[PDB]
Structure 1
Amino acid sequence: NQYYGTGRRKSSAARVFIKPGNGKIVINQRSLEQYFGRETARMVVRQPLELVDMVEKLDLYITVKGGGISGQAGAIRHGITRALMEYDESLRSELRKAGFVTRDARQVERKKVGLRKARRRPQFSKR
């Protein structure tokens, strides 16, 4: 049947649907190479598949919202990993060994009073 995974990264969240196939990937009704023009983003998306050796045994249906290129690419990689574990449960050990199961919780630090940014202070002068 269909297998599902929810992935999140920065302000992005990806819905992933995994089913046996031949290796075709759709992201927001576009192809992988059409959606992600950045070469790093394409490698991030694939990374779980090159690891478990199920690259061309599956079909990927994926919708994403929010964030940017690297966030969505990373968000898909997380939800993909959560889909494969709903597929086979013996993959958790090798996926976690690759750092793919962890939800990356790094977010933008808020701007604070008296600072120019989250941490950049205004220029100081003794006199």
Structure 2
Amino acid sequence: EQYYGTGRRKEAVARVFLRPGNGKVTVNGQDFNEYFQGLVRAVAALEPLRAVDALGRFDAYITVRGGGKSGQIDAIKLGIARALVQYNPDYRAKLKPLGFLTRDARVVERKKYGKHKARRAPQYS
């Protein structure tokens, strides 16, 4: 019925269900275009659908929790690049060579005692 992909990228959680068909997209109970309005990074995690030509092989149901607007986006990018290699384990071809797999450990750093914002050191004489 579905195809499932676990997505995260920097304190974000994006649960995807590549339920086949037309290509309509809902996250958290609304069209992808309603939620993600304004955003130009918002077109998007539907790009893994552009690495296996399947804009017209899948509608989408997604749940998402954490981080922010464009930080959630990169989660569904791991959530749509995983829900396609699950459907066709022969589709990681043109997915990891196209770099849509993996999961970026690019996390915001612990603020350091002394440096005003992790590294932005105090001004001295």
TM-score by length of 1: 0.93
State the shift of 1:84 in Å.
Answer: 0.6
Contact 1:41 1:69 in 2 (8 A): no
Is this contact kept in 2: 1:16–1:79, CA < 8 A?
yes
- Taking the aligned partners of 1:28 and 1:53, their CA distance within structure 2 comes to 25
Partner of 1:38: 38
CA distance in 2, matches of 1:13, 1:75: 6
Per-residue CA distance 1:79-126 (angstroms, 9 max, x = gap): 11111111001111210012110101100001011110111100021x
Alpha-carbon offset, residue 59 of structure 1: 1.6
Contact map agreement 2:115 2:122 (CA 8 A) in 1: yes
Correspondence for 2:28: 28
Deviations 1:4-58 (A, max 9, x none): 1100011101000112111011100010110111342322222111121000211
Query: Which position in structure 2 is the counterpart of 1:120?
Result: 120
The structure richer in strand per residue is: 1
Runs of 4+ in structure 1 off by over 6 angstroms are none
Runs of 5+ consecutive residues of structure 2 not aligned to the other structure: none
Match of 1:15 in 2: 15
| Shift in Å, 1:2 | 1.7
Identity %: 53
| Structure 2 CA distance for aligned equivalents of residues 120 and 36 of structure 1 | 33
- Structure of greater Rg: 1
In structure 2, what is the equivalent of residue 97 of structure 1? 97
TM-score, reference length from structure 2: 0.94
Residue ranges of structure 1 left out of the alignment (5+ in a row)? none
- Counting matched residue pairs gives 125
- Equivalent in the alignment of 1:68: 68
